[PDB]
Design a protein around this ligand. Structure first.
Ligand SMILES: O=C(OCCN1CCOCC1)C1(c2ccccc2)CCCCC1
Ligand SMILES: O=C(OCCN1CCOCC1)C1(c2ccccc2)CCCCC1
Ligand SMILES: O=C(OCCN1CCOCC1)C1(c2ccccc2)CCCCC1
Ligand SMILES: CCCCCCCCO[C@@H]1O[C@H](CO)[C@@H](O)[C@H](O)[C@H]1O
Lengths: 215, 215, 216
């Protein structure tokens, strides 16, 4: 009838306005400024000591929203042509906090999702190459890169680069990316299992905490 | 004697020989020596100044075969395990001219297609590792690398490496490669959309110029 | 009982794994990790090509009929786990393989995770290994030997011109997927895939014909 297609894009737009109003009106456990300031506070000492102190601070300020020491493990992350490792501390459907970094020189595509991802370097260097330009920037400990919603860059990390990462938005929209290189390159399905496990642990902790505070 | 198998073999051989004869007896808008000399002439300037001057020269010598300024945009190129960026100026089924390069350190497979691809460096370095050897060669501004037909090499580019590229042959035979990393790694389908858009704009410009000559 | 069928599948997989593991534990092998490691470190002070030739000659002398001749040796590109190198296969069976590996460009990525132990003795260059579960990597130089253990997955990195002698023992088919992924979902270099299939078929047929010659 020459009209049906306008109704499908209108239904997707209704869904998008619904989700956008929800994400703009929702309450969040953390904010990117809090995580960025906490990470920049310990940017002067060793990155492992910084990891420990930031974990302690996050468990103190937000009890029931951070995994315990028995649930912390380093999991390899192969995505977008790069390879690093993560230690997940918090994860819901709209938020995640983790410690990211690499001990090797890597780089590739940063991904493009419906979420905002901030990274505060604890040690090393962080080269970001934004879209549409011919020049990149290097960020140092204390600085923070804000991978905006819907924008795609090229990331490059030198050996020994470690940072604290906070993401807010629609978290599932990232999942595919985080697994792509594992499905079509590394074939390390044990790491896939580890990732699914730690994500499930964080989600279950968050759900049980929501159950407890309601009653 | 199996008849359908022999017929398939003979038909595919006749099709390949037909395409080969058409490529051997076809007229072309550019040649690799033209693009290479034009790029080497301006290789001593800043690569952005060189970009401007090379675009102006290409539009002067070949009017109606280069996209206008409102249609030029930098689109990411993830392929063969490396990540760079392109600005497509011309593209047909048998030719393409573009500005390629990266602002990060990358490298990977060069691909292996039925087309000859020449790259003249305006800035940076270009490490080529030919097939069947244990040593590579570094190339500097002014040099021209010819990725030959059916040949596969290893490419590596340092941060800030920019070059002018001309490809001639059966251009569609590259498409799969050019999209592989996008489908199974980056999942950046908006960059895929940009690539499809610019390639379609170039093909439409070429068909429009073909129509303008006849009437 | 649907649980009966799933338990049957689990028990069958378990008995097959146990059968293959017992066979690997009770099998005789042509080479060992220490042999290849010491032989490569012996020539690790020369240029990597002179070392290549000397190691090939010594290996063909000590184990005749188990290593390809000069007419079957060729360099084949190897894209895997996000890194790109080159290999020259000298020996390969279902449980063993010996080859020369290395890269002329700076590369790195996932090391893979298979049911086989893979040793690499550096003849030239540098080898950065990043073990799983740690936040620090380690660089190894010519003369050193890296042991990619069974079931472990690391991050590998090699600088331009790094060359080594590789020996793998275990269930070699368990590597096939990792060896082909980048070719299927990235490089599309099916001619390099053909070359890989060709050299491995040559090696397998060499092993089979050598075993037939022993019996008659
Ligand atoms: O842990 C990650 O990767 C950080 C690396 N950074 C690099 C810079 O760009 C953003 C991602 C991601 C994750 C993995 C698993 C659970 C939750 C999140 C976060 C989104 C990006 C890929 C996967
Ligand atoms: O834009 C590109 O990439 C140049 C980079 N070069 C670097 C040297 O080796 C060949 C590729 C390609 C393209 C393909 C199709 C349309 C428009 C552009 C050209 C072929 C290689 C990948 C895709
Ligand atoms: O020949 C290879 O490539 C060695 C590369 N090495 C480098 C050091 O780390 C381990 C892998 C492999 C292969 C290629 C082709 C067919 C069957 C196997 C052997 C298993 C490990 C990867 C792929
Ligand atoms: C990636 C971690 C740092 C590696 C050493 C880089 C030293 C400076 O490198 C420079 O960085 C600039 C911004 O990216 C670019 O303009 C230059 O092309 C690049 O040479």
């Amino acid at each position: 009838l020459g009209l049906r297609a306008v109704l499908v894009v209108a239904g997707l737009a209704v869904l998008l306005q619904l989700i956008r109003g929800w994400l703009s009106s929702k309450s969040y456990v953390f904010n990117r400024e809090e995580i960025a300031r906490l990470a920049k506070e310990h940017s002067g000492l060793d990155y492992e000591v910084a990891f420990s102190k930031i974990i302690v601070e996050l468990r103190k300020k937000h009890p029931g929203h951070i995994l315990q020491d028995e649930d912390l493990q380093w999991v390899f992350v192969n995505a977008g042509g790069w390879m690093g490792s993560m230690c997940l501390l918090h994860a819901s459907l709209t938020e995640y906090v983790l410690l990211f970094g690499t001990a090797v020189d890597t780089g590739g595509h940063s991904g493009r999702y419906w979420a905002e991802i901030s990274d505060t370097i604890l040690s090393g260097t962080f080269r970001q190459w934004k879209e549409g330009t011919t020049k990149s920037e290097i960020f140092y400990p204390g600085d923070t890169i804000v991978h905006e919603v819907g924008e795609a860059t090229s990331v490059q990390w030198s050996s020994g680069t470690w940072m604290v990462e906070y993401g807010r938005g629609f978290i599932p929209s990232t999942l595919a990316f985080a697994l792509a290189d594992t499905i079509f390159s590394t074939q390390d399905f044990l790491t896939l299992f580890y990732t699914v496990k730690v994500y499930s642990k964080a989600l279950l902790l968050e759900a049980s905490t929501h159950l407890s505070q309601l009653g």
